[PDB]
């Protein structure tokens, strides 16, 4: 259902409801004394309240109140930073974001950065967890957040370990120029990648130089994977991809090299980008691009010479489904 | 013998740094889910191809049994990953013969239970356990299929 449409009433007191949940969490988890016999009760309803809030309003008091605890007092066992991140936008879906929340969230990101600086910590989640998500998001609100002094307190380091060396790559757009200066002091970019993040927030388009070794070695060491994979037989669909991320680059006109049709093999999505006029049509699927990004896909589905089968794909899916998404897709960008 | 489609699955669990083995004989529910839905972004910059698609592809796994085993209560009594090795099979509709074996293995998976069973009849108590596949910040760490049935 589209709860967003429905109207609201008695907003006054539910504000005290949520501030009460917040203060309850603060009091319970704040001291050394934590009762798990208490943890087995409504801990869950506490998250349940922190959710259906979007679809509900929030003055500065209530929104500040939820953010203090949400960034400060919830135990990690039921909470990873990824689902935290996901939860904080949807609170900001139905309201604005004042200086206060900027302040608090920046405090969170810096001291949580200070939390992970450890020989072992890997900062795991089921999203990937680069609170460069946070950096870019705060950048998305307002014009700029140069990170004031938190920039400097993140710069102040030494030879040490390698953790912050690439970790600070998360928050560069929320940093000063001296950040890039003493980054250039050691080890600019060697990550086999860099695209994953730089292309995500800062670089994106307009310049994709001769990066040389990256894609070439990708193909060089993936041909042997192809051989030893199709010969023996395994098919894992492990969630990490760059062949598709460059196949989409190929027809996006960002990549104009002639060395793209090489692999053949698997990932019929790659064939889908790179093989217009002979593509295997007995692989119809409402996926890949169905994960419809926006207009890049208007150009994707331009395809003056191939439309006739995709319109029957729309037939098959929209006709045999009540899901609103697929027909909302069908109408405009496929017209 | 009329309409009795019913199969079986074997599921194993292991924590890292040691050859752990917690297992179940069956998984009655074995619900696998794949949910994908994007965010609300309206940056609106013309010279900015988005091509975001997705890179999360969350998984959901569930098993049920009466087995916590017995020996790990022993020793274990005396992130903490809970890696899982599935074991299932497939059949050819043409031949309906035993020819294929299916494996599923993860390097980052953690359990996620709802600690409120509290149900008002003491039932057979098939302690349903809900799972979650976690992802590190290194690479990959998703699956391994070990497709068999070579021929």
mmCIF file with all atom_site columns, N, CA, C and O in Angstrom, chain A residues 51-78:
data_model
loop_
_atom_site.group_PDB
_atom_site.id
_atom_site.type_symbol
_atom_site.label_atom_id
_atom_site.label_alt_id
_atom_site.label_comp_id
_atom_site.label_asym_id
_atom_site.label_entity_id
_atom_site.label_seq_id
_atom_site.pdbx_PDB_ins_code
_atom_site.Cartn_x
_atom_site.Cartn_y
_atom_site.Cartn_z
_atom_site.occupancy
_atom_site.B_iso_or_equiv
_atom_site.pdbx_formal_charge
_atom_site.auth_seq_id
_atom_site.auth_comp_id
_atom_site.auth_asym_id
_atom_site.auth_atom_id
_atom_site.pdbx_PDB_model_num
ATOM 1   N N  . UNK A 1 51 ? 10.728 3.258  12.848 1.00 0.00 ? 51 UNK A N  1
ATOM 2   C CA . UNK A 1 51 ? 10.483 3.174  11.428 1.00 0.00 ? 51 UNK A CA 1
ATOM 3   C C  . UNK A 1 51 ? 9.299  3.949  10.863 1.00 0.00 ? 51 UNK A C  1
ATOM 4   O O  . UNK A 1 51 ? 9.488  4.906  10.137 1.00 0.00 ? 51 UNK A O  1
ATOM 5   N N  . UNK A 1 52 ? 8.088  3.531  11.152 1.00 0.00 ? 52 UNK A N  1
ATOM 6   C CA . UNK A 1 52 ? 6.923  4.143  10.553 1.00 0.00 ? 52 UNK A CA 1
ATOM 7   C C  . UNK A 1 52 ? 6.962  5.453  11.283 1.00 0.00 ? 52 UNK A C  1
ATOM 8   O O  . UNK A 1 52 ? 6.267  5.637  12.276 1.00 0.00 ? 52 UNK A O  1
ATOM 9   N N  . UNK A 1 53 ? 7.807  6.337  10.781 1.00 0.00 ? 53 UNK A N  1
ATOM 10  C CA . UNK A 1 53 ? 7.927  7.659  11.347 1.00 0.00 ? 53 UNK A CA 1
ATOM 11  C C  . UNK A 1 53 ? 7.942  8.427  10.093 1.00 0.00 ? 53 UNK A C  1
ATOM 12  O O  . UNK A 1 53 ? 7.363  9.492  9.965  1.00 0.00 ? 53 UNK A O  1
ATOM 13  N N  . UNK A 1 54 ? 8.552  7.848  9.099  1.00 0.00 ? 54 UNK A N  1
ATOM 14  C CA . UNK A 1 54 ? 8.421  8.452  7.847  1.00 0.00 ? 54 UNK A CA 1
ATOM 15  C C  . UNK A 1 54 ? 6.961  8.162  7.715  1.00 0.00 ? 54 UNK A C  1
ATOM 16  O O  . UNK A 1 54 ? 6.491  7.155  8.239  1.00 0.00 ? 54 UNK A O  1
ATOM 17  N N  . UNK A 1 55 ? 6.225  8.998  7.014  1.00 0.00 ? 55 UNK A N  1
ATOM 18  C CA . UNK A 1 55 ? 4.776  8.865  6.933  1.00 0.00 ? 55 UNK A CA 1
ATOM 19  C C  . UNK A 1 55 ? 4.285  9.476  8.225  1.00 0.00 ? 55 UNK A C  1
ATOM 20  O O  . UNK A 1 55 ? 3.153  9.266  8.607  1.00 0.00 ? 55 UNK A O  1
ATOM 21  N N  . UNK A 1 56 ? 5.150  10.198 8.929  1.00 0.00 ? 56 UNK A N  1
ATOM 22  C CA . UNK A 1 56 ? 4.749  10.945 10.123 1.00 0.00 ? 56 UNK A CA 1
ATOM 23  C C  . UNK A 1 56 ? 5.707  12.143 10.230 1.00 0.00 ? 56 UNK A C  1
ATOM 24  O O  . UNK A 1 56 ? 6.853  12.038 9.799  1.00 0.00 ? 56 UNK A O  1
ATOM 25  N N  . UNK A 1 57 ? 5.272  13.283 10.774 1.00 0.00 ? 57 UNK A N  1
ATOM 26  C CA . UNK A 1 57 ? 6.128  14.507 10.796 1.00 0.00 ? 57 UNK A CA 1
ATOM 27  C C  . UNK A 1 57 ? 7.174  14.572 11.923 1.00 0.00 ? 57 UNK A C  1
ATOM 28  O O  . UNK A 1 57 ? 7.218  13.656 12.741 1.00 0.00 ? 57 UNK A O  1
ATOM 29  N N  . UNK A 1 58 ? 8.005  15.632 11.996 1.00 0.00 ? 58 UNK A N  1
ATOM 30  C CA . UNK A 1 58 ? 8.979  15.613 13.082 1.00 0.00 ? 58 UNK A CA 1
ATOM 31  C C  . UNK A 1 58 ? 9.553  17.018 13.193 1.00 0.00 ? 58 UNK A C  1
ATOM 32  O O  . UNK A 1 58 ? 10.266 17.474 12.296 1.00 0.00 ? 58 UNK A O  1
ATOM 33  N N  . UNK A 1 59 ? 9.197  17.719 14.265 1.00 0.00 ? 59 UNK A N  1
ATOM 34  C CA . UNK A 1 59 ? 9.779  19.022 14.519 1.00 0.00 ? 59 UNK A CA 1
ATOM 35  C C  . UNK A 1 59 ? 11.235 18.859 14.933 1.00 0.00 ? 59 UNK A C  1
ATOM 36  O O  . UNK A 1 59 ? 11.727 17.747 15.135 1.00 0.00 ? 59 UNK A O  1
ATOM 37  N N  . UNK A 1 60 ? 11.923 19.993 15.077 1.00 0.00 ? 60 UNK A N  1
ATOM 38  C CA . UNK A 1 60 ? 13.347 19.947 15.391 1.00 0.00 ? 60 UNK A CA 1
ATOM 39  C C  . UNK A 1 60 ? 13.597 19.133 16.649 1.00 0.00 ? 60 UNK A C  1
ATOM 40  O O  . UNK A 1 60 ? 14.559 18.364 16.716 1.00 0.00 ? 60 UNK A O  1
ATOM 41  N N  . UNK A 1 61 ? 12.735 19.284 17.654 1.00 0.00 ? 61 UNK A N  1
ATOM 42  C CA . UNK A 1 61 ? 12.929 18.544 18.893 1.00 0.00 ? 61 UNK A CA 1
ATOM 43  C C  . UNK A 1 61 ? 12.870 17.046 18.658 1.00 0.00 ? 61 UNK A C  1
ATOM 44  O O  . UNK A 1 61 ? 13.797 16.318 19.017 1.00 0.00 ? 61 UNK A O  1
ATOM 45  N N  . UNK A 1 62 ? 11.790 16.567 18.035 1.00 0.00 ? 62 UNK A N  1
ATOM 46  C CA . UNK A 1 62 ? 11.632 15.133 17.852 1.00 0.00 ? 62 UNK A CA 1
ATOM 47  C C  . UNK A 1 62 ? 12.707 14.538 16.962 1.00 0.00 ? 62 UNK A C  1
ATOM 48  O O  . UNK A 1 62 ? 13.235 13.454 17.235 1.00 0.00 ? 62 UNK A O  1
ATOM 49  N N  . UNK A 1 63 ? 13.045 15.238 15.876 1.00 0.00 ? 63 UNK A N  1
ATOM 50  C CA . UNK A 1 63 ? 14.047 14.707 14.959 1.00 0.00 ? 63 UNK A CA 1
ATOM 51  C C  . UNK A 1 63 ? 15.438 14.728 15.582 1.00 0.00 ? 63 UNK A C  1
ATOM 52  O O  . UNK A 1 63 ? 16.191 13.750 15.469 1.00 0.00 ? 63 UNK A O  1
ATOM 53  N N  . UNK A 1 64 ? 15.782 15.798 16.292 1.00 0.00 ? 64 UNK A N  1
ATOM 54  C CA . UNK A 1 64 ? 17.002 15.767 17.074 1.00 0.00 ? 64 UNK A CA 1
ATOM 55  C C  . UNK A 1 64 ? 16.994 14.628 18.073 1.00 0.00 ? 64 UNK A C  1
ATOM 56  O O  . UNK A 1 64 ? 17.992 13.927 18.247 1.00 0.00 ? 64 UNK A O  1
ATOM 57  N N  . UNK A 1 65 ? 15.854 14.411 18.726 1.00 0.00 ? 65 UNK A N  1
ATOM 58  C CA . UNK A 1 65 ? 15.788 13.398 19.774 1.00 0.00 ? 65 UNK A CA 1
ATOM 59  C C  . UNK A 1 65 ? 16.050 12.012 19.209 1.00 0.00 ? 65 UNK A C  1
ATOM 60  O O  . UNK A 1 65 ? 16.816 11.229 19.781 1.00 0.00 ? 65 UNK A O  1
ATOM 61  N N  . UNK A 1 66 ? 15.425 11.693 18.079 1.00 0.00 ? 66 UNK A N  1
ATOM 62  C CA . UNK A 1 66 ? 15.658 10.378 17.506 1.00 0.00 ? 66 UNK A CA 1
ATOM 63  C C  . UNK A 1 66 ? 17.098 10.258 17.040 1.00 0.00 ? 66 UNK A C  1
ATOM 64  O O  . UNK A 1 66 ? 17.711 9.195  17.182 1.00 0.00 ? 66 UNK A O  1
ATOM 65  N N  . UNK A 1 67 ? 17.676 11.334 16.494 1.00 0.00 ? 67 UNK A N  1
ATOM 66  C CA . UNK A 1 67 ? 19.008 11.175 15.919 1.00 0.00 ? 67 UNK A CA 1
ATOM 67  C C  . UNK A 1 67 ? 20.066 10.991 17.006 1.00 0.00 ? 67 UNK A C  1
ATOM 68  O O  . UNK A 1 67 ? 21.002 10.203 16.824 1.00 0.00 ? 67 UNK A O  1
ATOM 69  N N  . UNK A 1 68 ? 19.957 11.699 18.141 1.00 0.00 ? 68 UNK A N  1
ATOM 70  C CA . UNK A 1 68 ? 20.905 11.430 19.228 1.00 0.00 ? 68 UNK A CA 1
ATOM 71  C C  . UNK A 1 68 ? 21.055 9.935  19.471 1.00 0.00 ? 68 UNK A C  1
ATOM 72  O O  . UNK A 1 68 ? 22.146 9.374  19.331 1.00 0.00 ? 68 UNK A O  1
ATOM 73  N N  . UNK A 1 69 ? 19.953 9.270  19.828 1.00 0.00 ? 69 UNK A N  1
ATOM 74  C CA . UNK A 1 69 ? 20.026 7.855  20.172 1.00 0.00 ? 69 UNK A CA 1
ATOM 75  C C  . UNK A 1 69 ? 20.411 7.011  18.966 1.00 0.00 ? 69 UNK A C  1
ATOM 76  O O  . UNK A 1 69 ? 21.285 6.139  19.065 1.00 0.00 ? 69 UNK A O  1
ATOM 77  N N  . UNK A 1 70 ? 19.790 7.273  17.812 1.00 0.00 ? 70 UNK A N  1
ATOM 78  C CA . UNK A 1 70 ? 20.018 6.444  16.637 1.00 0.00 ? 70 UNK A CA 1
ATOM 79  C C  . UNK A 1 70 ? 21.482 6.444  16.241 1.00 0.00 ? 70 UNK A C  1
ATOM 80  O O  . UNK A 1 70 ? 21.994 5.432  15.750 1.00 0.00 ? 70 UNK A O  1
ATOM 81  N N  . UNK A 1 71 ? 22.180 7.549  16.469 1.00 0.00 ? 71 UNK A N  1
ATOM 82  C CA . UNK A 1 71 ? 23.608 7.592  16.221 1.00 0.00 ? 71 UNK A CA 1
ATOM 83  C C  . UNK A 1 71 ? 24.442 7.246  17.447 1.00 0.00 ? 71 UNK A C  1
ATOM 84  O O  . UNK A 1 71 ? 25.652 7.043  17.318 1.00 0.00 ? 71 UNK A O  1
ATOM 85  N N  . UNK A 1 72 ? 23.835 7.153  18.622 1.00 0.00 ? 72 UNK A N  1
ATOM 86  C CA . UNK A 1 72 ? 24.616 7.017  19.843 1.00 0.00 ? 72 UNK A CA 1
ATOM 87  C C  . UNK A 1 72 ? 24.342 5.744  20.627 1.00 0.00 ? 72 UNK A C  1
ATOM 88  O O  . UNK A 1 72 ? 25.290 5.057  21.018 1.00 0.00 ? 72 UNK A O  1
ATOM 89  N N  . UNK A 1 73 ? 23.077 5.399  20.879 1.00 0.00 ? 73 UNK A N  1
ATOM 90  C CA . UNK A 1 73 ? 22.754 4.454  21.942 1.00 0.00 ? 73 UNK A CA 1
ATOM 91  C C  . UNK A 1 73 ? 22.177 3.132  21.450 1.00 0.00 ? 73 UNK A C  1
ATOM 92  O O  . UNK A 1 73 ? 21.559 2.411  22.245 1.00 0.00 ? 73 UNK A O  1
ATOM 93  N N  . UNK A 1 74 ? 22.355 2.788  20.177 1.00 0.00 ? 74 UNK A N  1
ATOM 94  C CA . UNK A 1 74 ? 21.738 1.475  20.037 1.00 0.00 ? 74 UNK A CA 1
ATOM 95  C C  . UNK A 1 74 ? 22.799 0.390  19.881 1.00 0.00 ? 74 UNK A C  1
ATOM 96  O O  . UNK A 1 74 ? 23.771 0.575  19.142 1.00 0.00 ? 74 UNK A O  1
ATOM 97  N N  . UNK A 1 75 ? 22.636 -0.741 20.572 1.00 0.00 ? 75 UNK A N  1
ATOM 98  C CA . UNK A 1 75 ? 23.671 -1.782 20.547 1.00 0.00 ? 75 UNK A CA 1
ATOM 99  C C  . UNK A 1 75 ? 23.882 -2.342 19.151 1.00 0.00 ? 75 UNK A C  1
ATOM 100 O O  . UNK A 1 75 ? 22.972 -2.365 18.319 1.00 0.00 ? 75 UNK A O  1
ATOM 101 N N  . UNK A 1 76 ? 25.108 -2.800 18.903 1.00 0.00 ? 76 UNK A N  1
ATOM 102 C CA . UNK A 1 76 ? 25.482 -3.238 17.567 1.00 0.00 ? 76 UNK A CA 1
ATOM 103 C C  . UNK A 1 76 ? 24.890 -4.589 17.204 1.00 0.00 ? 76 UNK A C  1
ATOM 104 O O  . UNK A 1 76 ? 24.849 -4.931 16.018 1.00 0.00 ? 76 UNK A O  1
ATOM 105 N N  . UNK A 1 77 ? 24.439 -5.368 18.189 1.00 0.00 ? 77 UNK A N  1
ATOM 106 C CA . UNK A 1 77 ? 23.973 -6.720 17.898 1.00 0.00 ? 77 UNK A CA 1
ATOM 107 C C  . UNK A 1 77 ? 22.773 -6.701 16.963 1.00 0.00 ? 77 UNK A C  1
ATOM 108 O O  . UNK A 1 77 ? 22.702 -7.489 16.015 1.00 0.00 ? 77 UNK A O  1
ATOM 109 N N  . UNK A 1 78 ? 21.826 -5.806 17.206 1.00 0.00 ? 78 UNK A N  1
ATOM 110 C CA . UNK A 1 78 ? 20.687 -5.645 16.321 1.00 0.00 ? 78 UNK A CA 1
ATOM 111 C C  . UNK A 1 78 ? 20.889 -4.542 15.299 1.00 0.00 ? 78 UNK A C  1
ATOM 112 O O  . UNK A 1 78 ? 19.972 -4.262 14.524 1.00 0.00 ? 78 UNK A O  1
#
